[PDB]
Amino acid sequence: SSISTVDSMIALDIDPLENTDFRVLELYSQKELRSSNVFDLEEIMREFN
Amino acid sequence: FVAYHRDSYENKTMQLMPDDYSNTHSTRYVTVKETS
Numbered sequence: 001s002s003i004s005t006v007d008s009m010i011a012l013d014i015d016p017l018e019n020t021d022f023r024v025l026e027l028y029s030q031k032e033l034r035s036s037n038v039f040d041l042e043e044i045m046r047e048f049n
Numbered sequence: 050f051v052a053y054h055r056d057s058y059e060n061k062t063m064q065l066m067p068d069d070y071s072n073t074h075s076t077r078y079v080t081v082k083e084t085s
């Protein structure tokens with residue numbers, strides 16, 4: 001018809017928590033961890049050989 | 050004291066040869082390539 005309708009629905013729309021795909025963060029690569037040492041055992045053994 | 054390499058002569062300007070590869074880092078340059 002042409003009659004207004006009372007809007008009495010108290011909206012409670014709680015948006016769901018969106019998914020998170022946690023990264024595997026890499027701070028120091030293997031090369032840096034191997035190069036962080038002054039004395040490399042492999043090089044010393046190669047020199048001795 | 051002295052230790053002559055060979056022929057007992059001395060004061061010879063001997064060149065250095067690129068030598069053969071030994072280690073990935075070392076780039077050795079040698080000369081020779083009851084004696085002494």
Ligand SMILES: *[C@@H]1O[C@H](CO)[C@@H](O[C@@H]2O[C@H](CO)[C@@H](O)[C@H](O)[C@H]2NC(C)=O)[C@H](O)[C@H]1NC(C)=O
Pocket residue numbers: 059060061
């Ligand atoms: C081979 O020749 C070199 C170059 O001439 C000689 O080097 C001299 O050595 C004496 C002794 O220690 C030093 O006082 C001189 O200063 C050196 N010369 C230079 C230009 O610095 C060397 O003695 C010679 N080797 C021998 C004769 O066995």
